[PDB]
């Protein structure tokens, strides 16, 4: 009984590998050989956001591309006005080991979580300007690693349960649970149409999930270590993935295989965060070597270097209009680049 | 002419002392400029240590420059410029000793009040090390302004006991820093075996000696040889003080930039 299913799984894996090989006729680099390079890209620090007292582990932009939320080890969230370098809110947290933070697309709520196994929802716009815990989401049996709002009422969280969950904030219940990972899920990325999302876990695999149906559409492999960051392409038909093997990879949903690899011999440190520009031509990646590298997403070439930080660049972020890039680091500073 | 004029209770005169002072002070001024650049540029070593080191080096550089340019008197008459340079030298070297006492206080914060965060900020450090000298120089000038300048050199006056306005603070700081130095050496010798388990005994002696000498040059205990300069009977002590204290900037540069791993790393990264 067990042997037959074990052999069946191997046959199915071989069939999937054969289909992926059959769909691979011409590499992305070969097709993009004739596209001219983007050239050297120089970005300068426009703003430096100071005020955090410990390592910044997370950061998220707003839909207005002006407001910014950041999370640090000192145990609080700060809402920043990036245009004017003004602190709009400073929200103390019950647990100081926060690892992720989310900003609702409406701008009315922020989320955070970490080793406390809770996704805490804060209402930014209450009566007389008091920020309080709107909802505490419990049900994860491991540390919560990422969270992204779908709307003001539902949110997707990833944890160390090797599972992801879709929540209903009004009821505080897990509407849908996404299972199938074998390692701790470290990253999430919502598709632009909010219908799909990809998750990267500590099993060198990325899984594409359907929010409504709660099933794994596709599984992507190729990495050799723990996937720390993941992000869709702007059109939603592809996504990028950074891991601890000092390698970024670009995966196509429809081709269901890796397209091209972003790596260099001089880079040996892990990748903490990845992000795309507004057109998808640039792949920005944050590294443990205190630096952020800009990659030509179509030619796998280092377009530029963001080298203003003194410790581990732990998070990146590109605004919706693509104007600026925010880099968070372990030196308790956020820098805005153009 | 000689560096021992800062401590001497008489007019010391020796061409050898003057030549030693000039050569050593030129080398020390070069090394102190390097020290200021290192302490202002090397980011990884920034802290209270580096702040006190930098301001001590600044005070030593300014004092040594004023000493090299204007310690000699011409014509045998005490003019206004002689009083001005006497007061400036008094302020500069008293500021250097105040920053040395701040070195000692920080060392106390390291080895006695071990827990960090209980200390003085940069503003308070600057206020102490630059305003206590201002207070002492102002009070001394208000009481006895005629004590600034001599017909031979432009440095205080030993006839009325005015040199003790510089010696007394120096003596107090030296005794306090000696106490904290002995405490630091005792704790360091107690804990070296735990810190470095497999560095043997000869290298133990070498490392302990180098660390103790670096702290000695920080704390100003090398100026204790100048407290016993009253007559020609102390030529050996005078030469010892002059050699050890004209090379103080060079020794500080060696032991706190060339013997620091982070400074060497930043130097390699710069080239």
């Amino acid at each position: 009984e067990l042997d037959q299913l074990r052999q069946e799984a191997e046959q199915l894996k071989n069939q999937i590998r054969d289909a992926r090989k059959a769909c691979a006729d011409a590499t992305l680099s070969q097709i993009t050989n004739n596209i001219d390079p983007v050239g050297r890209i120089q970005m300068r620090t426009r703003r430096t956001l100071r005020g955090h007292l410990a390592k910044i582990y997370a950061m998220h932009w707003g839909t207005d591309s002006r407001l910014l939320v950041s999370a640090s080890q000192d145990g609080k969230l700060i809402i920043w006005d990036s245009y004017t370098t003004n602190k709009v809110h400073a929200i103390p947290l019950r647990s100081s080991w926060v690892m992720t933070c989310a900003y609702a697309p409406s701008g009315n709520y922020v989320a955070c979580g970490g080793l406390d196994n809770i996704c805490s929802i804060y209402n930014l716009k209450t009566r007389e300007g008091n920020v309080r815990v709107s909802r505490e989401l419990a049900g994860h049996t491991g540390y919560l690693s990422c969270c992204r709002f779908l709307d003001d009422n539902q949110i997707v969280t990833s944890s160390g349960d090797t599972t992801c969950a879709l929540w209903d904030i009004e009821t505080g219940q897990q509407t849908t649970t996404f299972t199938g990972h074998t390692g701790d899920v470290m990253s999430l990325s919502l598709a632009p149409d909010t219908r799909l999302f990809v998750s990267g876990a500590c099993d060198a695999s990325a899984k594409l999930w359907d929010v409504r149906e709660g099933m794994c559409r596709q599984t992507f492999t190729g990495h050799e270590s723990d996937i720390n960051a993941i992000c869709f392409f702007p059109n939603g038909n592809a996504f990028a993935t950074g891991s601890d093997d000092a390698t970024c990879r670009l995966f196509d949903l429809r081709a269901d295989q890796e397209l091209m690899t972003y790596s260099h011999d001089n880079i040996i440190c892990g990748i903490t965060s990845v992000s795309f520009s507004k057109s998808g031509r640039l792949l920005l990646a944050g590294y443990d070597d205190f630096n952020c590298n800009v990659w030509d997403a179509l030619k796998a070439d280092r377009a530029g270097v963001l080298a203003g930080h003194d410790n581990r660049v732990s998070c990146l972020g590109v605004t919706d209009d693509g104007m600026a890039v925010a880099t968070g680091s372990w030196d308790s500073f956020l820098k805005i680049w153009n | 002419s000689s560096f021992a004029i800062l401590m001497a209770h008489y007019d010391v005169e020796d061409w050898k002392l003057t030549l030693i002072t000039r050569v050593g002070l030129a080398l020390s001024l070069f090394c102190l400029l390097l020290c200021i650049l290192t302490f202002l540029l090397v980011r990884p070593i920034q802290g209270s240590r580096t702040t006190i080191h930098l301001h001590l080096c600044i005070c030593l550089f300014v004092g040594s420059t004023i000493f090299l340019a204007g310690i000699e008197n011409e014509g045998g008459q005490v003019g206004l410029r002689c009083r001005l340079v006497a007061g400036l030298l008094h302020y500069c070297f008293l500021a250097a000793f105040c920053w040395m006492s701040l070195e000692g206080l920080e060392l106390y914060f390291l080895v006695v009040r071990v827990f960090q965060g209980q200390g003085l900020s940069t503003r308070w450090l600057c206020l102490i090390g630059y305003g206590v000298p201002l207070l002492i120089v102002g009070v001394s000038a208000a009481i006895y302004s005629k004590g600034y300048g001599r017909p031979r050199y432009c440095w205080l006056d030993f006839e009325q006991g005015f040199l003790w306005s510089f010696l007394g603070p120096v003596t107090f700081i030296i005794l306090c820093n000696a106490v904290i130095f002995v405490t630091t050496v005792w704790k360091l010798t107690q804990k070296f075996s735990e810190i470095n388990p497999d560095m043997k005994k000869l290298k133990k002696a070498r490392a302990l000696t180098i660390t103790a000498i670096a702290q000695l040059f920080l704390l100003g205990c090398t100026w204790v040889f100048g407290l016993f300069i009253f007559d020609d009977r102390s030529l050996v002590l005078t030469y010892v003080f002059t050699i050890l204290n004209c090379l103080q900037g060079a020794f500080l540069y060696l032991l706190h930039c060339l013997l620091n791993k982070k400074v060497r790393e930043e130097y390699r990264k710069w080239a």
Partner: protein, 213 residues
């Protein structure tokens, strides 16, 4: 322009609050607290007061933060690097319970040998010492540990064996020492013991910084 001034004033108030807590942050000492359900961890915490829980208290005007990891293990780099700024690891063990001593030793070996916890000290508390005197002279630790040498009915031999067993689970490059105390969870001297061990650890760090080479 009306709203801009109000926004700047609100930012200034937030900055003042952050500056007020910055001095506390730069002066805070963090300790990991690890223990099982039989280790008397709850009684120990209650005596000093008189998911992961943070306990804030002060000993001799020094702010301390004990981080109680309630049996949660992750063996991942992120979970361990969340605790890369602690000065010490406090480990409570039920010294009487010989049947669960191997599990405690295995947990100790898994935790203290991580690369993140290099250059942090270990404070090892062997609780239930009064219960050892009862259990010693009744059962033999050789029945659980065949490598034991000495008199199993002697308390000093058993205590030395326990401390040696915990010390041997630490791999090479032991930069910081291991502190062991034979105490009870209701003892009133425990806070002073932790204070002295942490002070010694920080003195070790300070003198190593004073080291020129």
């Amino acid at each position: 322009s009306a709203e801009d001034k109000a926004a700047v004033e609100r930012s200034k108030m937030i900055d003042k609050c952050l500056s007020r807590e910055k001095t506390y942050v730069k002066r805070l000492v963090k300790i990991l607290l690890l223990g099982a359900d039989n280790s008397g961890k709850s009684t120990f915490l209650k005596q000093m007061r008189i998911g992961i829980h943070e306990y804030d208290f002060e000993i001799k005007n020094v702010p301390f933060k004990m981080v109680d990891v309630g049996g949660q293990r992750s063996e991942r780099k992120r979970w361990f690097e969340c605790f890369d700024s602690v000065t010490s690891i406090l480990f409570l063990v039920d010294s009487s319970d010989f049947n669960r001593l191997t599990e405690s030793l295995n947990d100790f070996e898994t935790i203290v040998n991580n690369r993140v916890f290099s250059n942090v000290s270990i404070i090892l508390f062997l609780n239930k010492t009064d219960l050892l005197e009862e259990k010693v002279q009744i059962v033999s630790i050789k029945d659980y540990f065949l490598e034991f040498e000495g008199d199993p009915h002697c308390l000093r031999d058993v205590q030395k064996f326990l401390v040696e067993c915990f010390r041997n689970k630490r791999r090479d490059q032991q930069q910081k020492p291991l502190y062991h105390h034979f105490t009870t969870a209701i003892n009133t001297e425990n806070a002073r013991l932790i204070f002295r061990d942490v002070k010694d650890t920080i003195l070790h760090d300070n003198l190593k910084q004073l080291m020129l080479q």
